[PDB]
Structures are given as structure tokens and as C-alpha cells.
Amino acid sequence: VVGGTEAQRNSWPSQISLQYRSGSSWAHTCGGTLIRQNWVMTAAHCVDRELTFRVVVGEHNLNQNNGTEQYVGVQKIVVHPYWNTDDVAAGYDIALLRLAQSVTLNSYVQLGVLPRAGTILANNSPCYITGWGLTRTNGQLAQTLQQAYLPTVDYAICSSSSYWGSTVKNSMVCAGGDGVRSGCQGDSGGPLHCLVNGQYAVHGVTSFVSRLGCNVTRKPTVFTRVSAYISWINNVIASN
């Protein structure tokens, strides 16, 4: 997260850290959202490679023991059937991970609230992006969970020539673009929490930013619109 601030520890309890094994050590690569005690929602491009993955819930500081963490392996990876790794702009950047064991829900670990199917947010709706991703373009990961206020930019405006143009689809959500705050590498797969009817719901899965950089004016961070995949998500969890 570029231009963010440290989140209160465990204030976004559904946020998870997706890590892969590199030799005898582990490295954070993406964010994700705990949607069931044994299911995590993340981006398809995060699990495109054949690596050994593990999920960490209740995490805050990646390098220190916070006394709230739970580590669990990944038993199954279900990528959306239309996902095309060579065309992130085509959409479908979403994947569901079945955890090897069910995590224990508590003060630091809770399920994320998903939107009702088809829900579209009005322009400039209040949302927050969270993650341990780079704090600057071509920079380094954040040690502690970061958050940044990132209001939405409706489709009509985001898909115009002044912003992303035809690179964005109606199956995506755009947020930010103020040139100061944005998601960045490492935030991928993470949530976009938006205030709807008094509660924060996960409306987006961080997908991509401009090749020019993370925080670019009129180049909002783009997210997979969760509300367009509710039926798919329910069908996978109900038959797997």
C-alpha cells in the first residue's frame, strides 16, 4: 500500500497473508480474505505458479511474533475457469483456496462479509485497501499491515479515455487514483473494504495497477468485483 498508514493491530480480522516456500524459508506474496473457517478468497494471479503455499491469519507484523497468528496449509486451489494469466485485463482474477485445517475464529480472526450478488457501489463510495504490499513503486514490502482510504471511481468514469479506458471491464471495481495512495505489488489478492449499510464488506480483490507505477494520477487501483462472482463462490464452497 502506497501512501497508507499502519492499521490498528487486528482491526481487519479477515485479512490474510498468503506466503510461498522459498527453500527453507517463507515469503509473503499476496493478500487474501478469510470467507469460511476453511476457505480463503484471493487473486488468481497469486496462485498461478506451482509453489507450496501457506496462509497466515491473525497476522500484523510479518517479521515478529504478535502472539495472535495461526499458520495453515493449502489443501486445494480453485482458480476461476475463465482466468487467462496472459490477459489480466480480461478479468476473472479470482481464486478460492481450501485450507488444510479450519482456523479458530476469535478476536484476531474473523470471516469477511461479502456483498449481495450484483451490488454496484456509487461513485466515490468510502473504501479502504489493506495489505503488506510495497509502500512505494519498486520499493519493499511493509513489515506491518497498512491501510489507505481509497474511494471508488464508478465504471463510467474509470472506463473513460481519461482513466483506464477499455482496459477495465464492468466485472471490476476501480478505487483511488489520487496519485498519492494506491495498492502495489504484494497487496494483490487482498481486500477492498467498503462501507455499505453501516458495515464493511469486501467488494474487491486487488488485481492490478499501471505498468507506469503503483500510485499514478487517474490510474486507480483495479479490483475484481466480488459481487459479480457470488454465485460462483457459493457453488464452489457448496461442492468442495
The footprint of Ca ion (CB under 5 A) covers 61, 66
| Complex with Ca ion: residue 70 or 137, whichever CB lies closer | 70
| Complex with Ca ion: residue 145 or 222, whichever CB lies closer | 145
Instruction: Give the Cα-Cα-Cα angle 67, 38, 115 (nearest 5 degrees).
Output: 100
Catalytic residue among 188, 207, 210, 227: 188
For the four alpha carbons of 236, 237, 239 and 240, in that order, the dihedral sign comes to positive
240 is in an annotated binding site: no
Catalytic residue among 93, 187, 203, 227: 93
Is 86 annotated in the active site? no
Q: Which of 82, 81, 76 is closest to 97 using CA atoms?
A: 76
Q: For Ca ion, which residue has the nearest CB? A: 66
64 is in an annotated binding site: yes
Q: What is the C-alpha separation between 130 and 45, in angstroms, rounded? A: 18
DSSP 112: P
Catalytic residue among 28, 45, 80, 193: 45
61 is in an annotated binding site: yes
Q: What is the C-alpha separation between 126 and 175, in angstroms, rounded? A: 9
Amino acid of residue 215: N
Is 25 annotated in the active site? no
38 is in an annotated binding site: no
Q: What is the C-alpha separation between 154 and 139, in angstroms, rounded? A: 29
CB of 61 to Ca ion, least distance (A): 4
Return the active site residues. 45, 93, 188
Point out the annotated binding site for Ca(2+). Answer: 59, 61, 64, 69
